[PDB]
Design a protein around this ligand. Structure first.
Ligand SMILES: CCCCCCCCCCCCCCCCCC(=O)OC[C@H](COP(=O)([O-])OCC(O)COP(=O)([O-])OC[C@@H](COC(=O)CCCCCCCCCCCCCCCCC)OC(=O)CCCCCCCCCCCCCCCCC)OC(=O)CCCCCCCCCCCCCCCCC
Ligand SMILES: CCCCCCCCCCCCCCCCCC(=O)OC[C@H](COP(=O)([O-])OCC[N+](C)(C)C)OC(=O)CCCCCCCCCCCCCCCCC
Ligand SMILES: CCCCCCCCCCCCCCCCCC(=O)OC[C@H](COP(=O)([O-])OCC[N+](C)(C)C)OC(=O)CCCCCCCCCCCCCCCCC
Ligand SMILES: CCCCCCCCCCCCCCCCCCCC(=O)O[C@H](COC(=O)CCCCCCCCCCCCCC)COP(=O)(O)OCCN
Ligand code: HEM
Ligand code: HEM
Ligand SMILES: CCCCCCCCCCCCCC(=O)OC[C@H](COP(=O)([O-])O)OC(=O)CCCCCCCCCCCCC
Ligand SMILES: CCCCCCCCCCCCO[C@@H]1O[C@H](CO)[C@@H](O[C@H]2O[C@H](CO)[C@@H](O)[C@H](O)[C@H]2O)[C@H](O)[C@H]1O
Ligand SMILES: CCCCCCCCCCCCO[C@@H]1O[C@H](CO)[C@@H](O[C@H]2O[C@H](CO)[C@@H](O)[C@H](O)[C@H]2O)[C@H](O)[C@H]1O
Lengths: 383, 124, 438, 75, 63, 54
């Protein structure tokens, strides 16, 4: 017996990266998983390095980031790589989740990897939110203030919880120092959950774009998907290069180059672009608590896709009506993103409400109805 | 949804003259735009198989039907990875798109649902 | 509606009990005795079984050969068995050969030779029986189950007795045993099939009138057992089939919970992969076991004695890597007798039992065994109407109360035989006797 | 003579029926009490818990009414 | 020594009252007490430990 | 013993509820008892003992 199979440690690596039996027809949308692993590796390497030069104390934090930019050898690169890769991480994660929804990757027997995946997504949001505060610029402070004040909506104990989270009566030094410690930790937790969702997946194997079994026709992960992953790795690195070296601040907010000032409020307090759809959903509900619930529900509702999809067929490749509905759902999600950064003004207020209703009605009404009707059309149409 | 549900609802539609007059043409168009026939599949090849009931139905297929299904899946997988469509005899014609699996899964499900009912019987 | 069981007594205190069936041509007559191995001490353990052998070895009148011939000439057969609490000697014959058979039974019981030469001859036959029960796995399992559950108590002893006793049993102690125990007030003469009661009573007056009465005549089926939670493992990797019994202390014949325990037993029920219908049974355990191929068979039992009982299940399985699952799912179904059962399961089990208790009695031997058992354990034959009423009185909520005091979180006696590496240690088995979720 | 067994099918969902669930209702109750006692115990230290819940309990409630003397309090 | 039906001697360990409710209740009292102290200890530990995140003395001094 | 077992021990839900309620009681009473004991063995030494002078 080959050593890679005989030795228990080598055999675990073997089972995931080498002999792992894959469908022979995975398309390029199956490459986002390895891009997410790449983003995670970049964030760990750059993040640990930034931590060697960063000071978490509020009197020194912003200045330590300027020290990184100006004095540390290649500090500018490490900082820009870390900041831009956070954005790329969300592009890749939305693509990965989009793939999963389009191809029915959430259906049995893959409910567990999908459900762990939803938690990974929540952990990424928390990780990125806390990392953004560490700069302690104007957007850092004011973003932390408004987002942490949402917790004040928890009935009875909400205010006490906020003061507990802050370690004081407003966002200050205690908050910054605890966000540093937790920002360091959370990526390790995220790595663990990423591993868990892959172990859960390994019982059924990858799905494929046709939605059928691949047990009839398997390919080794290596060399086929190893070399196919390299193409998207280099495409990713080209995109990375264009941002990091030629336009490093394109995805950022200029106000984060102003040191945090609790007195002066910035003109507009917006989250980072990748959180904007959820912010639009929050704004849509007039009630504070209502808004917070809706915002959380917008992510947790992903957990019900296995139930509300009534199709007897996995994925959308052969479902014209589902494909159109999916298209509208995705574009609506992008419009929500845009509406998260407009001013609270007519006519965007009502538009945000309509788009929020559409977002939820996809899960609760449209997908159950469309999937029921398509079942009937497949059966009657092929008689 | 169970195959049973889908089949029963479809039969209600096919009974109603008005309903069938509207639904049947729509369903035929849907199937044409679906385009699974352009990869040489039959409709039943697309049904999710990773369930105890469906695994049991597949084991009950006659060997011939079972061997042919395997070939259609492998052939479709090859078209998928090559980004090609079936041509000529590989295209499933409407007359070839037979419901080979439906009778087996309906029997499997009939027993499974009867079992669930009888597990809940109350002596009167 | 079956014919009424007639009952008469003699002066010595011998009960005569009969149930006639004018549709059959054969008759089972016999003597049921409220005595068995449990009446021995440790020194004469095996005596009751020893006597059963010598009962057919010749009497004061007929030699062994004459005995053989007399029965051959009658046309039917004789049979005997000794259990822990009961001894039976019966004769199946033709209708008009009943007086002969009563006469032979009376002879072998009262007037047996017990000649030293025959004791010495059987002493080897019985020694060989010790090394051949080893094959009857169910019997091996149940004998160890009694030995451990009733550790160092009379019910814990085997019927055969130890090797040492077999070598030292004398005609003196044989005579003493049958003189002390085989008394008229402990004996029932039973007739089923083509028997007239009045004729049978006359035959009893003719043959069994000079039976000793005991000094202190207690009622029939009169008895303290202290159950031991414990295990016996008889691992044998060369056997293909594992045999496992699990039991708790059950109910006596006269318990108020006797019928409740029978209903509980029927909720779990039996299963056998070789029977076609078994895959479709309503029992939850049956479904789990058949769908997952966990066992070849299981058989629920509720064994009763005069003052105690064992309630449990006997499992056989070739699935040696899933013994853990089999035992786990079995004990989780027992848990549900405490936590979950409702009128749905209870009414179903009652329906099944109302028939089952009547179905069992389908031949003259089964009828005689039923009359004899009931007369020696309860002192009376219970009519089907009374049995139907006692079953009807069992509610779901009686079953729940019974299971909560008898099964839930209780010590078990556990015997495993064969490839039982996969059977976990005592604690992990006993931990399944409760549910942390409840 | 009986021509047919006499039974009905009770309503059921995901393998649960009302007879079974009704047996477990009390158990959910006790688990709810356990969760309640546990949760309250976990936040017994929280000042608001003392102020709003614990100090209002009759007799016992004075256990949680504690004032630092003004002479001993820097804040 | 040879017969497997002769149970080895367990009399040095056997309790006479092994089947009684009092017998079981005693062992559950021990288990329960252990669970009780573990719950009280966990609560104390969690409360004291997590209080580090509440405003420190220097923060409260400036309030 | 049977009664006690049946009410507080038999159902794990009840057993856990009893354990948690007992932990609550223990925690409160132990706190009070230690406070008093600590004050007696360190009598005259603590701030609370000299506070009255000031
Ligand atoms: C971020 C980090 C950078 C790394 C890059 C990774 C992106 C790779 C990826 O997943 O997308 C490439 C991906 C190529 O993937 P593929 O494996 O060749 O085909 C996947 C489908 O089979 C392709 O579906 P198809 O075969 O049905 O062809 C559809 C596609 C044509 O596909 C191609 O020819 C390619 O044409 C379009 O619909 C394009 C949209 C314009 C319509 C007007 O392009 C698309 O699928 C674009 C369609 C999306 C809408
Ligand atoms: C913008 C709207 C997009 C709609 C897509 C409709 C399908 C289509 O044309 O796509 C081409 C292809 C069609 O692929 P296909 O697999 O259905 O068809 C292959 C060709 N045949 C039918 C012959 C087998 O679709 C994809 O590859 C879809 C992947 C979805 C990724 C979406 C990312 C959005 C992120 C938002 C997260 C929340
Ligand atoms: C660290 C925190 C410890 C929490 C323990 C709180 C109470 C739970 C407990 O004692 O468990 C007893 C219980 C029961 O212990 P048991 O499993 O020995 O009792 C089962 C049998 N009855 C119900 C009849 C008593 O254990 C659990 O429920 C497991 C949780 C422990 C963690
Ligand atoms: C940046 C990383 C790029 C640099 C590594 C690429 C390999 C360089 C050339 C070496 C090469 O082609 O030889 C193969 C080594 O590739 C290998 O063994 C690896 C194949 C592809 C490299 C990385 C796989 C990526 C897959 C997942 C991406 C994960 C991203 C997350 C961080 C062996 O050729 P052969 O093994 O085919 O046999 C052929 C007979 N010996
Ligand atoms: C750190 C973030 C993540 C990493 C590194 C990661 C990595 C991967 C990898 C390598 C695969 C197998 C290859 C592939 O299909 O692309 C995979 C599959 C999957 N992931 Fe993720 N993932 C992440 C986040 C998520 C999230 C947020 C979700 C869901 C909300 C998710 C759900 C899934 C599912 C359902 C599959 C199986 C898809 C299929 O083959 O059909 N993952 N992931
Ligand atoms: C999932 C992985 C991670 C994500 C998505 C992430 C995200 C972010 C983001 C958005 C920022 C604000 C960047 C800026 O505008 O300047 C940031 C800053 C920071 N992150 Fe991370 N991070 C991750 C992992 C890590 C790790 C593992 C460390 C290890 C300490 C770390 C250390 C830092 C430090 C020190 C800063 C502040 C200096 C700076 O702004 O560049 N990060 N992170
Ligand atoms: C604090 C710790 C909380 C632990 C809570 C455990 C609750 C478990 C309750 C439970 O299992 O109910 C089962 C019951 C149905 O019974 P069955 O069908 O499993 O017999 O299920 C239903 O009735 C529904
Ligand atoms: C993707 C990152 C690369 C590192 C790999 C991840 C490290 C942790 C993975 C170990 C978790 C256990 O993962 C489990 O391992 C065993 C053997 O390794 C696999 O077992 C599989 O492969 C072996 C031979 O290769 C076969 O004996 C077995 O029939 C098959 O199921 C399981 O399918 C996998 O689920
Ligand atoms: C899921 C778990 C639920 C949330 C956990 C709650 C976290 C915070 C809870 C309260 C923490 C602060 O709560 C507070 O704790 C400290 C001890 O720690 C107690 O303080 C008490 O003990 C400390 C030393 O032990 C003394 O210095 C003090 O004089 C005395 O009052 C307070 O009486 C209590 O009000």
């Amino acid at each position: 017996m080959a050593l890679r199979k005989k030795n228990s440690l080598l055999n675990m690596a073997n089972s995931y990266v080498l002999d792992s039996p894959q469908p022979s027809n995975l398309n390029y949308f199956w490459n986002f998983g390895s891009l997410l692993a790449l983003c995670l590796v970049i964030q760990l390497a750059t993040g640990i390095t930034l931590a060697m030069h960063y000071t978490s104390h509020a009197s020194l934090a912003f200045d330590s980031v300027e020290h990184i930019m100006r004095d540390v050898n290649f500090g500018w690169f490490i900082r820009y790589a870390h900041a831009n890769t956070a954005s790329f991480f969300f592009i890749c994660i939305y693509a990965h989740m989009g793939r999963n929804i389009y191809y029915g990757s959430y259906k049995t027997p893959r409910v567990l990897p999908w459900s762990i995946g939803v938690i990974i997504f929540l952990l990424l949001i928390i990780t990125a939110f806390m990392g953004y505060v560490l700069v302690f610029g104007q957007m850092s402070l004011w973003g932390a203030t408004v987002i942490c004040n949402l917790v004040s909506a928890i009935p009875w104990l909400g205010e006490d919880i906020v003061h507990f989270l802050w370690g004081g009566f407003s966002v200050g030094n205690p908050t910054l120092q605890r966000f540093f410690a937790l920002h360091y930790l959370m990526p390790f937790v995220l790595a663990v959950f990423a591993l868990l969702h892959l172990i859960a997946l390994h019982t059924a194997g990858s799905s494929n774009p046709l939605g059928i079994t691949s047990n009839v026709d398997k390919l080794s992960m290596h060399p086929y998907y190893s070399f196919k992953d390299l193409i998207t790795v280099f495409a990713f690195l080209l995109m990375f290069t264009l941002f990091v070296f030629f336009s490093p601040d394109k995805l950022g907010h200029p106000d984060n180059y102003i040191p945090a000032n609790p007195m002066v409020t910035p003109a507009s307090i917006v989250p980072e672009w990748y959180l904007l759809p959820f912010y639009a959903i929050l704004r849509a509900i007039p009630d504070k608590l209502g808004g917070v619930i809706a915002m959380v529900a917008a992510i947790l509702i992903l957990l019900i896709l296995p139930i509300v999809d009534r199709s007897i067929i996995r994925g959308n490749a052969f479902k014209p009506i589902s494909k159109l509905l999916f298209g509208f759902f995705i574009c609506n999600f992008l419009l929500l993103g845009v509406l998260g950064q407009v001013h609270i003004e007519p006519p965007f207020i009502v538009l945000g409400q309509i788009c929020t209703i559409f977002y939820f009605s996809y899960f609760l009404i449209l997908l159950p109805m469309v999937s029921t009707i398509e079942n009937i059309f497949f059966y009657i149409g092929s008689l | 949804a169970s195959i049973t549900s889908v089949v029963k609802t479809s039969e209600l539609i096919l009974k109603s003259p008005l309903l069938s007059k509207i639904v049947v043409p729509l369903a035929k168009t849907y199937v044409k735009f679906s385009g699974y026939r352009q990869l040489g599949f039959k409709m039943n090849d697309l049904i999710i198989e990773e369930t105890p009931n469906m695994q049991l139905a597949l084991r009950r297929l006659p060997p011939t039907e079972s061997y042919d299904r395997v070939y259609r899946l492998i052939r479709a997988t090859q078209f998928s990875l090559s980004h090609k469509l079936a041509t000529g005899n590989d295209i499933t014609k409407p007359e070839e798109d037979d419901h080979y699996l439906i009778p087996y899964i309906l029997d499997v499900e009939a027993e499974a649902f009867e079992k669930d009912a009888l597990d809940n019987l109350e002596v009167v | 509606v079956s014919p009424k069981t007639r009952t008469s007594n003699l002066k010595n205190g011998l009960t005569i009990a009969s149930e006639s069936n004018p549709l059959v041509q054969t008759a089972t007559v016999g003597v049921w005795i409220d005595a068995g191995s449990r009446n021995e001490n440790a020194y004469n353990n095996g005596t009751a079984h020893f006597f059963e052998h010598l009962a057919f070895k010749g009497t004061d009148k007929r030699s062994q050969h004459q005995l053989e011939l007399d029965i051959e000439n009658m046309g039917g057969h004789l049979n005997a068995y000794t259990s822990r609490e009961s001894t039976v000697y019966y004769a199946k014959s033709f209708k008009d050969d009943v007086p002969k058979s009563v006469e032979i039974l009376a002879d072998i019981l009262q007037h047996s030779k017990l000649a030293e030469s025959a004791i010495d001859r059987e002493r080897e036959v019985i020694t060989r029986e010790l090394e051949e029960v080893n094959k009857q796995y169910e019997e091996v399992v149940f004998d160890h189950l009694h030995a451990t559950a009733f550790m160092n108590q009379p019910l814990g002893r085997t019927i055969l007795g130890p090797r040492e006793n077999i070598q030292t049993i004398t005609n003196t102690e044989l005579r003493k045993f049958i003189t002390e125990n085989y008394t008229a007030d402990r004996m029932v003469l039973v007739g089923a099939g083509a028997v007239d009661h009045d004729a049978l009573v006359e035959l009893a007056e003719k043959y069994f009138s000079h039976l000793p009465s005991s000094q202190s005549p207690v009622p029939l089926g009169t008895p303290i057992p202290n159950f031991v939670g414990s295990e016996v493992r008889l691992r044998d990797d060369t056997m293909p089939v594992a045999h496992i019994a699990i039991a708790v202390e059950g109910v006596s014949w006269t318990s108020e919970d006797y019928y409740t325990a029978l209903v509980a037993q029927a909720i779990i029920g039996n299963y056998d992969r070789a029977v076609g219908t078994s895959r479709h049974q309503g029992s939850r355990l049956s479904n789990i076991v058949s769908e997952n191929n966990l066992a070849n068979s299981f058989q629920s039992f509720s064994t009763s004695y005069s003052d105690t009982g064992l309630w449990g299940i006997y499992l056989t399985s070739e699935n040696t890597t899933q013994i853990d699952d089999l035992v786990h799912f079995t004990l989780k179904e027992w848990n549900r007798l405490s936590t979950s059962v409702s009128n749905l399961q209870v009414e179903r089990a009652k329906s099944q039992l109302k028939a089952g208790l009547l179905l069992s009695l389908d031949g003259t031997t089964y009828v005689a065994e039923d009359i004899g058992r009931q007369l020696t354990t309860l002192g009376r034959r219970v009519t089907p109407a009374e049995v139907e009423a006692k079953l009807e009185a069992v509610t779901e909520h009686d079953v729940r109360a019974w299971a909560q005091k008898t099964l839930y979180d209780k010590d078990i006696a556990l015997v495993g035989l064969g490839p039982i590496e996969g059977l976990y240690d005592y604690n992990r088995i006993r931990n399944d006797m409760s549910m942390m979720r409840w | 003579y009986v021509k047919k067994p006499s039974y009905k099918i009770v309503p059921h969902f995901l393998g649960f029926n009302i007879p079974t669930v009704s047996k477990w209702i009390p158990i959910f109750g006790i688990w709810g009490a356990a969760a309640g006692i546990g949760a309250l115990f976990l936040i017994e230290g929280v000042p608001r818990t003392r102020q709003d819940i614990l100090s209002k309990i009759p007799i016992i409630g004075e256990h949680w009414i504690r004032e630092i003397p003004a002479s001993d309090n820097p804040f | 020594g040879k017969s497997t039906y002769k149970i080895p001697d367990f009399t040095p360990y056997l309790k006479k009252d092994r089947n009684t409710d009092a017998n079981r209740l005693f062992s559950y009292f021990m288990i329960g007490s252990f669970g009780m102290l573990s719950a009280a200890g966990a609560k104390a530990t969690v409360q004291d430990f997590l209080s580090n995140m509440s405003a420190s003395a220097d923060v409260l001094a400036m309030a | 013993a049977t009664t006690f077992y049946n009410v507080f021990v038999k159902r794990n839900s009840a057993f856990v509820a009893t354990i948690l309620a007992s932990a609550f009681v223990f925690d409160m009473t132990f706190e009070t008892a230690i406070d008093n004991f600590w004050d007696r063995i360190n009598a005259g030494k603590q701030w609370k003992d000299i506070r009255h002078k000031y």
